[PDB]
Coordinates of C-alpha atoms and ligand atoms in Angstrom, one line a residue:
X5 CA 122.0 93.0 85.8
X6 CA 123.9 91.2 88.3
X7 CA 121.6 92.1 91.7
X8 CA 123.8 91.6 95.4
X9 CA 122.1 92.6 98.8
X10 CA 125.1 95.6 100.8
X11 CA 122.7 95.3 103.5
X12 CA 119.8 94.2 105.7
X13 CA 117.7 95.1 108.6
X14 CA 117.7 98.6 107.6
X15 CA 114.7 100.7 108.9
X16 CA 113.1 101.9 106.0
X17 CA 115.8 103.1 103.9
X18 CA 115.8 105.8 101.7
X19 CA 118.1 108.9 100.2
X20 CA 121.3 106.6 99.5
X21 CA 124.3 108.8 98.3
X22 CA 127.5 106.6 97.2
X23 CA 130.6 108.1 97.9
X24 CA 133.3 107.8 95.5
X25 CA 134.5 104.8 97.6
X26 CA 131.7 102.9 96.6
X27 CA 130.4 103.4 100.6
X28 CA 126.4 104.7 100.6
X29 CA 125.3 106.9 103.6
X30 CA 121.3 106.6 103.6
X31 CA 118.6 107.5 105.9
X32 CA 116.5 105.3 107.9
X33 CA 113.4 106.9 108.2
X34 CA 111.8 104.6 111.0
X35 CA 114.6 104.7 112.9
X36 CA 115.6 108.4 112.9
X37 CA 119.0 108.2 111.8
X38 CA 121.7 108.3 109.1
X39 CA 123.8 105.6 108.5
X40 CA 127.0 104.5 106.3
X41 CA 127.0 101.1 104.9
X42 CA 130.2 99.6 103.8
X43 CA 131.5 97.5 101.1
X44 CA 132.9 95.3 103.8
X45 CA 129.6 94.6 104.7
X46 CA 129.8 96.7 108.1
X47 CA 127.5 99.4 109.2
X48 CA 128.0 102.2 111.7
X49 CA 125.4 104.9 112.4
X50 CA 126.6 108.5 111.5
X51 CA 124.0 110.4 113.4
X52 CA 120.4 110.4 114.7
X53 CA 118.1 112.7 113.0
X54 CA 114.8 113.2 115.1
X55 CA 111.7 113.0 113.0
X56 CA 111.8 111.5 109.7
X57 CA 114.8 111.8 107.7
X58 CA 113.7 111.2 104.4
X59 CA 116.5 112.3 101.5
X60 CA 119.7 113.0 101.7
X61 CA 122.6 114.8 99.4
X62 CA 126.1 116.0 100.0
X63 CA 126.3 119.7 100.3
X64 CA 129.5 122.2 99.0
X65 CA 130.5 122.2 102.6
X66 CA 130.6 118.5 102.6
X67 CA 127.9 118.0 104.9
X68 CA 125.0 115.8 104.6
X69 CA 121.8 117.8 103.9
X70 CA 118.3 116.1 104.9
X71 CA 114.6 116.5 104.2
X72 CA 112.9 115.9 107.1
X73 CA 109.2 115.3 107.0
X74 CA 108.9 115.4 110.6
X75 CA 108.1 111.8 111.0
X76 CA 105.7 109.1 109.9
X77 CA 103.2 107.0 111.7
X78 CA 104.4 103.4 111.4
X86 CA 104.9 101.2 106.7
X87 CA 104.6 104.3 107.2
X88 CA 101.1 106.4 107.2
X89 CA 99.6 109.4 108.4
X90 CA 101.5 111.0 111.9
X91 CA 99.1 111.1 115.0
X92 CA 99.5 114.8 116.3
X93 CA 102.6 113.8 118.6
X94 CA 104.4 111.7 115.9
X95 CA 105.1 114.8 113.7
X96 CA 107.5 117.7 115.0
X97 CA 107.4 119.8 111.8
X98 CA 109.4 119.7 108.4
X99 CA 112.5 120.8 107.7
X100 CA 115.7 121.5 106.1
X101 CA 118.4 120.0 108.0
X102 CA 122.1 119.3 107.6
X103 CA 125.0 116.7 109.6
X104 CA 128.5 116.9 110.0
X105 CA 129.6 113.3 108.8
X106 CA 132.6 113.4 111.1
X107 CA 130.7 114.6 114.6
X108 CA 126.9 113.8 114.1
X109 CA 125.7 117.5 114.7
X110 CA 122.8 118.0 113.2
X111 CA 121.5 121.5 112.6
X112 CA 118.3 122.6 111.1
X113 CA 118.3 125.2 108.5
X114 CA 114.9 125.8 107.3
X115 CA 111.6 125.2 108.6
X116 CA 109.7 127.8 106.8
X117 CA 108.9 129.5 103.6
X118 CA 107.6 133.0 103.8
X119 CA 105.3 132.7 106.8
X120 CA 104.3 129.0 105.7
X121 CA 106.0 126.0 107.4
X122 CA 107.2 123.1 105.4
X123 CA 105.5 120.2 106.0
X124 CA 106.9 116.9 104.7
X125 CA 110.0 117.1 102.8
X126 CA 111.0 114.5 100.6
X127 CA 114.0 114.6 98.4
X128 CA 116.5 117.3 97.5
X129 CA 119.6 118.2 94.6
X130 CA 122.3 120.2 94.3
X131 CA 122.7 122.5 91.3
X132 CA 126.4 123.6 90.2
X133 CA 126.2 126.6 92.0
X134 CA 125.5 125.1 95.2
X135 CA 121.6 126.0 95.0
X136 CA 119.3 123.6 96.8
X137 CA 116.0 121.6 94.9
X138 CA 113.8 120.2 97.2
X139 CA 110.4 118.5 97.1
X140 CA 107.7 118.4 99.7
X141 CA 105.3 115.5 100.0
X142 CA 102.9 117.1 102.5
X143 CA 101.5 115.6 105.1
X144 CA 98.1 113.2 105.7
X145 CA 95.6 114.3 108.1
X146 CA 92.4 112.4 109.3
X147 CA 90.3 113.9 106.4
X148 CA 92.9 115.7 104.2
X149 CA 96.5 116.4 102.4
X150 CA 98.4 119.0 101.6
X151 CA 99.1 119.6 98.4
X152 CA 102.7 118.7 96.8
X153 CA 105.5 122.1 96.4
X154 CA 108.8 122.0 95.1
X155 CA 111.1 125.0 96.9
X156 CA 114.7 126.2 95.7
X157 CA 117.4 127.4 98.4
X158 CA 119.7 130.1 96.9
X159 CA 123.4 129.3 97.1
X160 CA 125.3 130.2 100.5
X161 CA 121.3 128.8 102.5
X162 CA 120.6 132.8 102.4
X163 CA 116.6 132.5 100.6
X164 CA 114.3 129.7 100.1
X165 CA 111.9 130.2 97.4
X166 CA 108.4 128.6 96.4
X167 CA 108.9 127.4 92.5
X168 CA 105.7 124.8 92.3
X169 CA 103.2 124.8 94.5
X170 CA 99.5 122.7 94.3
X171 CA 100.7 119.2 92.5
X172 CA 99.7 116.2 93.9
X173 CA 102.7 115.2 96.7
X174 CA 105.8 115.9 95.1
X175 CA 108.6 113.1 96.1
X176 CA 111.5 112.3 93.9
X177 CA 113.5 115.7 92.2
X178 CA 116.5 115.8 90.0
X179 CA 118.3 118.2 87.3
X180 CA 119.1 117.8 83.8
X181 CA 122.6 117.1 82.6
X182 CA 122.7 120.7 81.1
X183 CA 120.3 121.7 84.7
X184 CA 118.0 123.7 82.3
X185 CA 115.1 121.2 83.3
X186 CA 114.0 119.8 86.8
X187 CA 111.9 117.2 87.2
X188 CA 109.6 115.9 89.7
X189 CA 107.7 112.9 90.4
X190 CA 104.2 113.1 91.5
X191 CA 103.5 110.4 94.0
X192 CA 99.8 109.2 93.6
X193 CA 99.8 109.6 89.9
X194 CA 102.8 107.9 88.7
X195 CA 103.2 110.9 86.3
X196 CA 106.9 112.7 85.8
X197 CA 106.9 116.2 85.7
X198 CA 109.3 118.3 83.8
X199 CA 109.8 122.6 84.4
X200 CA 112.1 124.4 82.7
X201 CA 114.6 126.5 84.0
X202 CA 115.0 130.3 82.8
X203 CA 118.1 130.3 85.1
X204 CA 119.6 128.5 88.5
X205 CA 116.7 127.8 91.0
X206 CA 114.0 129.7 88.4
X207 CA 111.1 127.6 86.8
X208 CA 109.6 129.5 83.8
X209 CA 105.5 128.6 82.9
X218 CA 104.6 125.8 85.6
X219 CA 105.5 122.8 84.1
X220 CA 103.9 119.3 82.5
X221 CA 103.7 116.1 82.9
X222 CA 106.2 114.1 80.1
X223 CA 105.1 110.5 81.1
X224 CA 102.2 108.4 82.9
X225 CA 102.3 105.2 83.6
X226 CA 99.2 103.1 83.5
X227 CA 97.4 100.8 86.1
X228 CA 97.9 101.1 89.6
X229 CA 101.5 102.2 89.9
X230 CA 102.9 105.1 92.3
X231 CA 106.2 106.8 91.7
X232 CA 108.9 107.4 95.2
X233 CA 112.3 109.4 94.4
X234 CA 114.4 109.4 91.6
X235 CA 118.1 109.6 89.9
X236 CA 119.0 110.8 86.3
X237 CA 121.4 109.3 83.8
X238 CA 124.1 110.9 82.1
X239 CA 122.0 110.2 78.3
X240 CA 119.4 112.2 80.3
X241 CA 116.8 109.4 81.0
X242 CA 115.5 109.8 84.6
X243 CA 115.3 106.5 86.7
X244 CA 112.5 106.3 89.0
X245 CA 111.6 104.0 92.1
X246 CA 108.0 103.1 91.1
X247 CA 105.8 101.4 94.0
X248 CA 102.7 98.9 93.5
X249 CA 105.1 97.1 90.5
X250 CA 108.1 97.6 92.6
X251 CA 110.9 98.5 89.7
X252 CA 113.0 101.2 88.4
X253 CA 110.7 103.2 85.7
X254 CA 113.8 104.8 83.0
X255 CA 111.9 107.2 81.2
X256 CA 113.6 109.5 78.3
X257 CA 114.0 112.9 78.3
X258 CA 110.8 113.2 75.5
X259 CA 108.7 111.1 78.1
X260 CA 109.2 108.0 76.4
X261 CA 109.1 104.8 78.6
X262 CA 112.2 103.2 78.1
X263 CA 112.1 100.3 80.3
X264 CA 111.3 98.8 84.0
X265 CA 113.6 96.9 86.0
X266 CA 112.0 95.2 88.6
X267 CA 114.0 94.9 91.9
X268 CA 111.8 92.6 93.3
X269 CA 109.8 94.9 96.5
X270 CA 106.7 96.6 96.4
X271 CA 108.0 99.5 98.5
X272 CA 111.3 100.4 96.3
X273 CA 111.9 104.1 97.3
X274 CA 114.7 105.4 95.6
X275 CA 117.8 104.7 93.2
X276 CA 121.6 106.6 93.3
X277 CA 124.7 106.0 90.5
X278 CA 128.1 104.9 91.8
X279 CA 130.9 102.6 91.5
X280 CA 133.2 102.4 88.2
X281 CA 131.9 105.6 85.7
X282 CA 129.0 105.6 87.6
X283 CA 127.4 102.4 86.3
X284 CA 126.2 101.0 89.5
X285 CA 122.7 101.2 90.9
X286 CA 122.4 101.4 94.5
X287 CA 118.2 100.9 95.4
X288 CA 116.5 101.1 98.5
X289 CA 114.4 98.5 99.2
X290 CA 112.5 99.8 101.9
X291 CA 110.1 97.0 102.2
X292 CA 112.7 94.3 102.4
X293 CA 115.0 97.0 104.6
X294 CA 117.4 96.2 102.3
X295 CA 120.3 98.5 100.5
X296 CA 120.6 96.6 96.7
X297 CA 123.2 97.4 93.9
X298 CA 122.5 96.2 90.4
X299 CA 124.5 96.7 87.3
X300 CA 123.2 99.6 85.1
X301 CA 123.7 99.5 81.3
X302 CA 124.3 103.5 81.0
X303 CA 126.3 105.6 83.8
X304 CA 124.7 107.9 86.0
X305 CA 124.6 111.4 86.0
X306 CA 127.6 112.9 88.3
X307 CA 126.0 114.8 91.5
X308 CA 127.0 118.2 92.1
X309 CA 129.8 118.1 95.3
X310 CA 129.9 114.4 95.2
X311 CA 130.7 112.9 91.8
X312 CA 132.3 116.4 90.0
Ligands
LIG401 C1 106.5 105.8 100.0 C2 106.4 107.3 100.0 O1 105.2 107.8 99.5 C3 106.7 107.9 101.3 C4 108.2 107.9 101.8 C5 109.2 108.0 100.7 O2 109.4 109.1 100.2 O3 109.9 106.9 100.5
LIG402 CA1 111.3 109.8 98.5
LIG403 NA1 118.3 109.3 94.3

């Protein structure tokens, strides 16, 4: 686990997605934009993305897609009124910076604080959403499903905890989701693409005081997640097992994406630290739909 800092000063970072040249284009959820970090050590800033960009993946139109939770107040806490301009579903042309927003509703109920978000094989769209915190109240976590071509978004979970890190199965007959406040993984089985079937359990809690942020899964099927308070990656096996914890050394670690050589190259967001990390991995990463196969 040899551990090298790509890059500092970063504004909370979060959604990293490693291109196959071993560049990462991330968000920066403080400062409203999306930005590509370079092995070369340079940084340029793709696009701003008003509100709070929160996750990012590479769509089959090779556009960056977003959850945007509509915006924090600032680490980050609950939005006063006028800090929060609605969630959404959102996606950037990586050559021009237009941003367009896609979804900002299901049915006749707004999203309120996307999170995190995967492609499945068919181009369908998994996304979480962390609610938002009020004076004297929360919403309640959701997980939604965008059918392929962006033509329906669907409710699949709805009334966890805040839902924050998501991510498929190598076969994509499971998704799971972490559940913030808990530290608890939760796994829901697919009958088919973008279709949980009864909704779905919790495979692994971890003990003490210990909060779990977004997520990537192995190739072997382990799920990797960023796991605040202890501040590590929490790899937990497919039958809930805890397999290990890497500890990356910040409180606030948000999330974790496989790149570099057969995919064996953690990058982690170190969003206390504003720092973008990469750390050797012992087992490759699952590829990402549109970005890795
Ligand atoms: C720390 C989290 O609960 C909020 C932002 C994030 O998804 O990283
Ligand atoms: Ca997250
Ligand atoms: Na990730």
């Amino acid at each position: 686990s040899n551990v090298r800092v790509l890059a500092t000063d970063l504004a909370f970072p979060e959604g990293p997605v490693v291109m196959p040249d071993g560049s990462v284009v991330l968000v920066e959820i403080r400062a409203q934009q999306l930005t590509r970090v370079w092995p070369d050590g340079r940084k340029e800033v793709v696009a701003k993305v008003p509100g709070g960009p929160n996750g990012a993946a590479l769509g089959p139109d090779g556009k960056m897609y977003i959850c945007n939770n509509g915006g924090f107040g600032w680490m980050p806490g609950a939005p006063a009124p006028h800090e929060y301009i609605g969630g959404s579903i959102q996606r950037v042309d990586l050559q021009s910076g237009e941003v367009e927003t896609l979804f900002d509703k299901c049915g006749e109920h707004p999203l309120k604080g996307p999170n995190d978000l995967v492609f499945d094989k068919h181009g369908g769209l998994w996304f979480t959403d962390l609610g938002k915190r009020r004076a004297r109240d929360m919403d309640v976590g959701a997980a939604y499903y965008i059918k392929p071509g962006m033509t329906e978004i669907t409710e699949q979970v709805f009334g966890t905890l805040p839902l924050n890190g998501i991510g498929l199965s190598p076969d994509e007959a499971t998704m799971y989701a972490a559940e913030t406040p808990t530290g608890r993984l939760w796994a829901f089985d697919l009958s088919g693409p973008g279709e949980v079937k009864p909704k779905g359990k919790p495979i692994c809690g971890l003990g003490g005081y210990q909060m779990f942020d977004s997520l990537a899964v192995e190739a072997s099927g382990n799920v990797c997640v960023a796991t605040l308070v202890s501040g590590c990656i929490s790899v937990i096996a497919p039958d809930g097992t805890l397999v290990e914890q890497v500890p990356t050394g910040d409180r606030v670690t948000t999330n974790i994406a496989f790149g570099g050589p057969d995919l064996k190259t953690a990058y982690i967001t170190l969003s206390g630290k504003g720092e973008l990390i990469a750390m050797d991995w012992s087992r490759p990463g699952l590829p990402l739909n549109f970005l890795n196969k």
